[PDB]
Amino acid sequence: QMRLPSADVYRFAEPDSEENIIFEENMQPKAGIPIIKAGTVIKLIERLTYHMYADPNFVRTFLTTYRSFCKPQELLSLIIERFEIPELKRFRKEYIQPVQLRVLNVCRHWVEHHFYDFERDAYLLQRMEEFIGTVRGKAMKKWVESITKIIQRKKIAFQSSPPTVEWHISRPGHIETFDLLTLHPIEIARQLTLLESDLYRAVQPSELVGSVWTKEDKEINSPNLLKMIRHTTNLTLWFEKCIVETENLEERVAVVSRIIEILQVFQELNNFNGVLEVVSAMNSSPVYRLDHTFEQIPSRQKKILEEAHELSEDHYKKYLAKLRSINPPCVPFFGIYLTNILKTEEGNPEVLKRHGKELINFSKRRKVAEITGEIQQYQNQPYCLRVESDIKRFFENLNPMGNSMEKEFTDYLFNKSLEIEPRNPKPLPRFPKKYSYPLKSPGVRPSNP
């Protein structure tokens, strides 16, 4: 056993006890390292830069979730303090050298994966560069030069051929004519999957940890998550609007049927966000009630729709099994993750108390980092599909609501539903056709090799 300084001169030398650190009964599955359940900030900082071994899982988790219990400015002070370490030959090689290298690994990981902390507080970076300058030694020169190179990079901020773009009534460049029935249903689904895939990939953990998308500054802290939820809501409203503004029954059956084809391609592409945008439109109050429309829908499409609906049923039990059974590229539904993060944070205490001493509940944070890790595993793999810039811009600019507010627009969709298919016993009226082009679908089978 080594001889370490007194706590009066070096806080990290204080020994482990039930009053300052606790562990889970299990070990890290691939590393055989204990899993920390809770501890004081000094003890969490000690284990983050531990001399006995490296703990990359703890480092990764800690840096993703520490801001609830420690400010970035306070973390930098604690790791500078940890580096400034006050028999002697073994202490220099088995405590000082490992610890000082683990502090630099933490610095390196922080600037690489959580640079937003530095972007948001220029003085934090001032202090990182100051501290990194005071580091002297041949053992550290390699790691000091790596940190500097990452900072300067951050300061100055792949397959075979994809399939052929599908076209239906609208031809390339004729944006004026683009609409639900004129664009190819395969291409609507591909271009929406591409938009939604990039929207999904842009959501960072800093928009999720601490449930910040639900707080008053959600627009400042979760902009990418909110743009992804808004696109989704917009597409669902657009599908509902397309349906209920097609007053003629035969044309409306054609619209519903084409949307169920778009869904089928969403299913083939593993775009679960798109699948649920279609299911959500079909189960809305204005569309659900259109019995005369769904009566005329082919059984094959009713069955496609019925199985897509079942993915949501029973707290997403089937959806979750399906998502777990596929591999990227895919576009998951984000809502489940949002509820799981929120409930984990609100259903577990920030602190545990042992012998009257407060310990930061680190397990609660680990659970959140496990959800954020699951989101990131689907963000790496892109889709092998070509972008069609005009169809892309068409979907990015969709604004079904126009200048109306939510209630006004949603009341309008419902009143449109009641007009086109009145409540029983009122008979079904007839309405004139609105589409001058043929309503026959080209199908969802790719028309080209």
């Binding site: 639900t214 669902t236 809305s284 659900y288 949501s312 707290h315 659970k367 209630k407």
Partner: protein, 167 residues
């Protein structure tokens, strides 16, 4: 088998709505919650001597997905319309939530309970008499709960099951 009541929690986000269902499920002395498992939203209870299972849907955090509520609301047998007593906008949002529930269910008499949640030590802005008046105007019960102490939680959920049984 025993009766299964499918309950739906509706309300504004950002004001601790999720504490209602979390407190019900977790024992009044347990505080380690995992929303990833089946037991976190399912609970066997005994109400007025009759044993039953509560299946509670709370999509807390998905409020921005405003076009997905109808799918959740149509299956639900009973609703807890939750607002925070320290947030007037959450109290004012209730009217549209009830309206959507009536629209989806195609009925003016839906088993529903209004819940005033005391989610923190911040000042009260919604007085009990305002909520009692709102609840009386809809013809539904009113229950106040505390997120910190579990007070009123069991009464909120049990009152709703009684509302469904008497439907």
């Amino acid at each position: 088998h025993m009766t299964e009541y499918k309950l739906v929690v509706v309300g504004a986000g950002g004001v601790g709505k999720s504490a209602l269902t979390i407190q019900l499920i977790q024992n009044h002395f347990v505080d380690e919650y995992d929303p990833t498992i089946e037991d976190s939203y399912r609970k066997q209870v005994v109400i007025d001597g009759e044993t039953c299972l509560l299946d509670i849907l709370d999509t807390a955090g998905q409020e921005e997905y405003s076009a997905m509520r109808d799918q959740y609301m149509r299956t639900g047998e009973g609703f807890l319309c939750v607002f925070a007593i320290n947030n007037t906008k959450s109290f004012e949002d209730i009217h549209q939530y009830r309206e959507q529930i009536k629209r989806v269910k195609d009925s003016d008499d839906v088993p529903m309970v209004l819940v005033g949640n005391k989610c923190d030590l911040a000042a009260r802005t919604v007085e009990s008499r305002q909520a009692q008046d709102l609840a009386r105007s809809y013809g539904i019960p009113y229950i106040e709960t505390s997120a910190k102490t579990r007070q009123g939680v069991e009464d909120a959920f049990y009152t709703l099951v009684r509302e469904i049984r008497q439907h």
